[PDB]
Write a structure and sequence with these properties.
alpha+beta, Cytochrome p450, 5-stranded mixed beta sheet, two-stranded antiparallel sheet, 15 helices, binds protoporphyrin IX containing FE, binds N-methyl(5-(pyridin-3-yl)furan-2-yl)methanamine, membrane
Length: 465
């Protein structure tokens, strides 16, 4: 054919706005795919975007033509602060250099190794102490979980953890929660279409911008402290490593290693390394309270494999198929980043006999893959059996793509999975979950869905086992 994928005809500037509901973008786009097919073009305001729905379309593009679909598209709210700098919301040689350096440096600091496993175990112990500190009282788990998650990546990028009583630490966590909520609301999705105008108007978007600025300013302050105390022969953390590479590159006019990329890359890892794991844990405990039979089976396996005295270790997962299946089902059901981070085609591309001109933005609808009816028998239900065969052994799925796939896939995936396993296991080993309502009345449908999937606010209690 040689034409862009079919789609509803757009109007000048507003694009397909009148055929979308900003409060429910995913549903709006899926409604349209019913009429046009799994691969279709939509106009988010002036942004022309090819939407990919279901497993086959997403994998054929992001993996079978991995290089062609390896550009990074926009996320207007985050782009407001990043401006194309840093490792996530960037492209070309910049993204390439920063990703290579970030992955290597994360490994140097223990990611994927015993060093970060010990760090996570230690922080998990501090979370158990905090939960015991509640005395079994009903509490909002939100910041108990995010403080613990954030301290892992914070130890790597800043060199040490934050005290749980640190007010400024709580402030930063509130900024992250607030920005993820904003991008998941109707105004946040309206902003993705009309940022050209909205960035200049009063409204919730200015408050989101100030939370991003608060975070950037905190990182800039940390980088400054590190600079005036730097030992080039003994780096303390990610920031020092990057500062050293910046010194070595000082005579290269075209280097990507300079201050703005240091601040933006560190900001990416601090926010990226905190919020999505935190949201996943929060959604996981809510699902476990909705499904007591699953919490019971989790407890049987933990008690049998690990017992009640020692701390869970990452190698325990190999002996724990039920917990592995439960964590996968929490990520599958939770669908925390439902439309991934947008990609962009690097060059003119032929895809399924459609034509995608260079620069065209792409929305890999991960949630549509996590719920693809060809891969999960009851995609709308929370059921760990989706990841187990008949003998209760763990069964992988090609449609398990919460970290996306391809050339710009999540490189925090290893750290995230180690955290999820160790925090869910260590919490469940030590506590049984007590809801403020009967399982039948617990609502696990999301509070907001846009850039992220945010669970409804709730309280619960952790009772020692
Ligand atoms: C439950 C946890 C997490 C989820 C669901 C998640 C998911 C994702 C997704 C969907 C993407 C976009 C991939 C693409 O464009 O195809 C991404 C990218 C990224 N993630 Fe994560 N992530 C998680 C945890 C982490 C952690 C712990 C870190 C940091 C240590 C992190 C760092 C990044 C970075 C730096 C990118 C950008 C990669 C690039 O542009 O080249 N993520 N993640
Ligand atoms: C968690 N991994 C991918 C992901 C989702 C949202 C973000 C993110 C948001 C703001 C700054 N840096 C990164 O990164």
């Amino acid at each position: 054919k040689g034409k862009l994928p079919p789609g509803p005809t757009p109007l000048p500037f507003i694009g397909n706005y009148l055929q979308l509901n900003t409060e429910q973008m995913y549903n709006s786009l899926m409604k349209i795919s019913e009429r046009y097919g799994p691969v279709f073009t939509i106009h988010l305001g002036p942004r022309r975007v090819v939407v990919l729905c279901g497993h086959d379309a997403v994998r054929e593009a992001l993996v079978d033509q991995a290089e062609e679909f390896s550009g990074r598209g926009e996320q207007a709210t985050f782009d407001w602060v990043f401006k194309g700098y840093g490792v996530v919301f960037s492209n070309g040689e910049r993204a390439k250099q920063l990703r290579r350096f970030s992955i290597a440096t994360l490994r140097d600091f223990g990611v994927g190794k015993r060093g970060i496993e010990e760090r996570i175990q230690e922080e998990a112990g501090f979370l158990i102490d905090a939960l015991r500190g509640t005395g079994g009282a009903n509490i909002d788990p939100t910041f108990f979980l995010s403080r613990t998650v954030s301290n892992v990546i914070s130890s790597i990028v800043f060199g040490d953890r934050f005290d749980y009583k640190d007010k400024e630490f709580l402030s930063l966590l509130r900024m992250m929660l607030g920005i993820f909520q904003f991008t998941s609301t109707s105004t946040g999705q309206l902003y993705e279409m009309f940022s050209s105008v909205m960035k200049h108007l009063p409204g919730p978007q200015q408050q989101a911008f100030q939370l991003l600025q608060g975070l950037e300013d905190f990182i800039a302050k940390k980088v400054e402290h590190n600079q005036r105390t730097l030992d080039p022969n003994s780096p303390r953390d990610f920031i020092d490593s990057f500062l050293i590479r910046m010194q070595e590159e000082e005579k290269n006019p075209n280097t990507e290693f300079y201050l703005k990329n240091l601040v933006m890359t560190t900001l990416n890892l601090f926010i990226g390394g905190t919020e999505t794991v935190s949201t996943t844990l929060r959604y996981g405990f809510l699902l476990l309270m909705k499904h007591p039979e699953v919490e019971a089976k989790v407890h049987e396996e933990i008690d049998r494999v690990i017992g009640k005295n020692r701390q869970p270790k990452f190698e325990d997962r190999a002996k724990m198929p039920y917990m592995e299946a439960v964590i996968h089902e929490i990520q599958r059901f939770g669908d925390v980043i439902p439309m991934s981070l947008a990609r962009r085609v690097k060059k003119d591309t032929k895809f399924r006999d459609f034509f995608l001109p260079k620069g065209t933005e792409v929305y890999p609808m991960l949630g549509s893959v996590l719920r693809d009816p060809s891969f999960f028998s009851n995609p709308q239900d929370f059921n760990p059996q989706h990841f187990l065969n008949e003998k209760g052994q763990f069964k992988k799925s090609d449609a398990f793509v919460p970290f996306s796939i391809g050339k710009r896939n999540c490189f925090g995936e290893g750290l995230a999975r180690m955290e999820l396993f160790l925090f869910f296991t260590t919490v469940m080993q030590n506590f049984r979950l007590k809801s403020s309502q009967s399982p039948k009345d617990i609502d696990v449908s999301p509070k907001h869905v846009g850039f992220a999937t945010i669970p409804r606010n709730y309280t619960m209690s952790f009772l020692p086992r």
